[PDB]
Amino acid sequence: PKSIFYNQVGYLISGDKRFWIQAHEPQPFALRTPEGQAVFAGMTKPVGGNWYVGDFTALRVPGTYTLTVGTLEARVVIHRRAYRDVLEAMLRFFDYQLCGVVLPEDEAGPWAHGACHTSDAKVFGTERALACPGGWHDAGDYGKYTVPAAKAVADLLLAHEYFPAALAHVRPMRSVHRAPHLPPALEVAREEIAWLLTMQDPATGGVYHKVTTPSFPPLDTRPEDDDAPLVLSPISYAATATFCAAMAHAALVYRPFDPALSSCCADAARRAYAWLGAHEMQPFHNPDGILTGEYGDAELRDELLWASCALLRMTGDSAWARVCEPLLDLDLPWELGWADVALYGVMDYLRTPRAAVSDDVRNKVKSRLLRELDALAAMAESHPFGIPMRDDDFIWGSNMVLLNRAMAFLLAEGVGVLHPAAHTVAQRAADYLFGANPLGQCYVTGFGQRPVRHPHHRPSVAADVDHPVPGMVVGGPNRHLQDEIARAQLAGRPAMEAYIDHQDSYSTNEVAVYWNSPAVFVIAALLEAR
């Protein structure tokens, strides 16, 4: 497959521009207008392994150019807002996943419905029932889970706070949101917050782990065709803590837009934390008779960290610094979910007014955060595609691992922790996700020259349209070959090549709400840069 590897979505006018080829020496290259006029030229340079890169960043005039190097040819496009449409489709994906709510045909097209899982969820072990209407279907399945929901919400909320201008005029589905009509990111994220609120037991303040069917309906199964009884898995520490942090964050962001919802989230967060103080950290386990997504976790101190730090920033009360800061000194991995969420708390802590926290602890936190970014930067400098990844990092949901890492750079920039490689990593992450990889694969449905055509997504599989729901970020290459398709097809291939666009490859070609949400953040960042 001797080919030119590039960002198949496009390049920003004022953005960094790079293409990849396999070679053993530098080669001259050139870009020409559609009419054949040479407008740019340069030399490729080695970046490790068999890989060479070409840099045409200085080419600022928008349009479609013919890139030539050696005998190889490719067409790249430069646009003022090249990632405008893909960002829109990425946020619109959340509306496509909406549950218990009719999606109008004029907006949802061939994947329209219809109200799925309207059944009042029976609490596990009992006959009492609460109405738990979504909200979003988590992944390719239709299950709704509290823990990963908190990440998806937090990311979209963070995307709004950081890059409101880039998201200001993206349009979610028209007839599914209420008043006051919020900025698109907040307009979309509110739906998941609303469902999450109904997941909190008013009796104990605790939060149910997941409301799903007992088992997984077939890949072919339509949402409404899935009418199995809805189980309500027990309250868990992880569910309550992540709920608490997400609500405290929601209560803070939505205040100048929806004061009514802001008030409701704040009270829900406090009650949720009250539960944490009276219950031990117990790892969730699937109830007997439940085989849906467990989303378990044995380490729960980072959840408490996030919950504490979120309430710290929500209240601005230095009383929270007493519980936050000891947890911040722990050697927990500072990551962005869904299981390891410590960095979310770190950010809330750093975005808290300096007068409410300890200076020496704040300096230590900033110092560690920079070290972590330094390590990622070193990884990106060694990687041929400039992304903060090693071979053993390419596991289940490697694209989220990548995107979370790019997000960490951009988040830290917002709190005065500026690493010089931050915006380079952001572009490289987008390049990789949009085709700049050993497979030349655009890992987003409905975009690029080699798009994802057969994702592990039941609404997409159900419809016989031979093209899935657009704007879905798939899991990406997984070296552990954790499905029957991958183990047969992808055996022997390098980590970055451990992907296949097969609808039955759920460990490489699955989608998720918490996979699109960091994608929204990173892509919005690139558009905001202008």
Sheet (strand 51-55) strand order = 18-22, 51-55, 45-46
Binding mask 211-230 for Zn ion (x = CB under 5 A): ------------x-------
Nearer to Ca ion, 44 or 404 (CB): 404
Is the distance from CB of 56 to CB of 41 less than 8 angstroms? no
Interaction of residue 116 with Zn ion, rule CB under 5 A? yes
CB of 374 to Ca ion, least distance (A): 24
Pick one of Ca ion, Zn ion, none as the site partner of residue 117 (Cβ within 5 to 8 A by kind).
Answer: Zn ion
| DSSP-derived pairing of the beta strands 45-46 and 51-55 | antiparallel
Pick one of Ca ion, Zn ion, none as the site partner of residue 372 (Cβ within 5 to 8 A by kind).
Answer: none
Nearer to Ca ion, 302 or 510 (CB): 302
Is the distance from CB of 98 to CB of 163 less than 8 angstroms? no
Pick one of Ca ion, Zn ion, none as the site partner of residue 306 (Cβ within 5 to 8 A by kind).
Answer: none
Nearer to Ca ion, 19 or 514 (CB): 514
Report the residue closest to Ca ion, judged by CB.
Answer: 302
* Count of chain residues binding Zn ion (CB under 5 A): 5
Q: How far is CA 240 from CA 128, 139, 222, 235, 320, in A?
A: 20, 21, 31, 7, 18
Helix (H), strand (E), coil (C) string for 181-196: CCCHHHHHHHHHHHHH
CB of 112 to Zn ion, least distance (A): 14
Nearer to Ca ion, 201 or 299 (CB): 299
d(CA 246, CA 150): 5
Pick one of Zn ion, Ca ion, none as the site partner of residue 302 (Cβ within 5 to 8 A by kind).
Answer: Ca ion
Pick one of Ca ion, Zn ion, none as the site partner of residue 299 (Cβ within 5 to 8 A by kind).
Answer: Ca ion
Is the distance from CB of 91 to CB of 167 less than 8 angstroms? yes
DSSP character at residue 326: H
**Burial tier of 30 (Cβ tally within 10 Å: 0-12, 13-18, 19+):** middle
Interaction of residue 99 with Zn ion, rule CB under 5 A? yes
Q: 270: which 2 tokens?
A: 């406090």
d(CA 342, CA 298): 14
Quickly count: other Cβ atoms within 10 Å of residue 330's Cβ.
Answer: 12
CB of 417 to Ca ion, least distance (A): 23
CB of 99 to Zn ion, least distance (A): 4
Nearer to Zn ion, 19 or 142 (CB): 142
> Residue 158: which of 362, 401, 377, 412 has the closest Cα?
412
Nearer to Ca ion, 192 or 297 (CB): 297
Place of tokens 């209560």: 251
**Burial tier of 73 (Cβ tally within 10 Å: 0-12, 13-18, 19+):** exposed
CB of 148 to Zn ion, least distance (A): 16
Interaction of residue 117 with Zn ion, rule CB under 5 A? yes
What is the signed CA dihedral for 405, 340, 161, 92, rounded to 10 degrees?
A: 80
Q: How far is CA 68 from CA 19, 23, 31, 311, in A?
A: 11, 14, 6, 55
CB of 97 to Zn ion, least distance (A): 9
Q: 239: which 2 tokens?
A: 């569910």
Pick one of Zn ion, Ca ion, none as the site partner of residue 91 (Cβ within 5 to 8 A by kind).
Answer: none
Q: Which stretch binds Zn ion (CB under 5 A): 39-47, 108-116, 443-451, 452-460?
A: 108-116
CB of 307 to Ca ion, least distance (A): 11
CB of 464 to Zn ion, least distance (A): 20
Nearer to Ca ion, 297 or 483 (CB): 297
Q: Which stretch binds Zn ion (CB under 5 A): 78-86, 95-103, 250-258, 316-324?
A: 95-103
Interaction of residue 51 with Zn ion, rule CB under 5 A? no
* DSSP letters for 119-186: SPEEETTSS-EE----SB--SSS--EEHHHHHHHHHHHHHHHHH-HHHHTT----TTS--SSPPPHHH
Nearer to Zn ion, 149 or 376 (CB): 149
Nearer to Ca ion, 29 or 344 (CB): 344
Binding stretches for Ca ion (CB under 5 A): 297, 299, 302
CB of 152 to Ca ion, least distance (A): 16
Nearer to Zn ion, 10 or 133 (CB): 133
CB of 111 to Zn ion, least distance (A): 13
| DSSP-derived pairing of the beta strands 18-22 and 51-55 | antiparallel
Binding mask 141-170 for Zn ion (x = CB under 5 A): -x----------------------------
Nearer to Ca ion, 213 or 242 (CB): 242
Is the distance from CB of 52 to CB of 21 less than 8 angstroms? yes
Where do contacts with Zn ion occur on this chain (CB under 5 A)?
99, 116-117, 142, 223
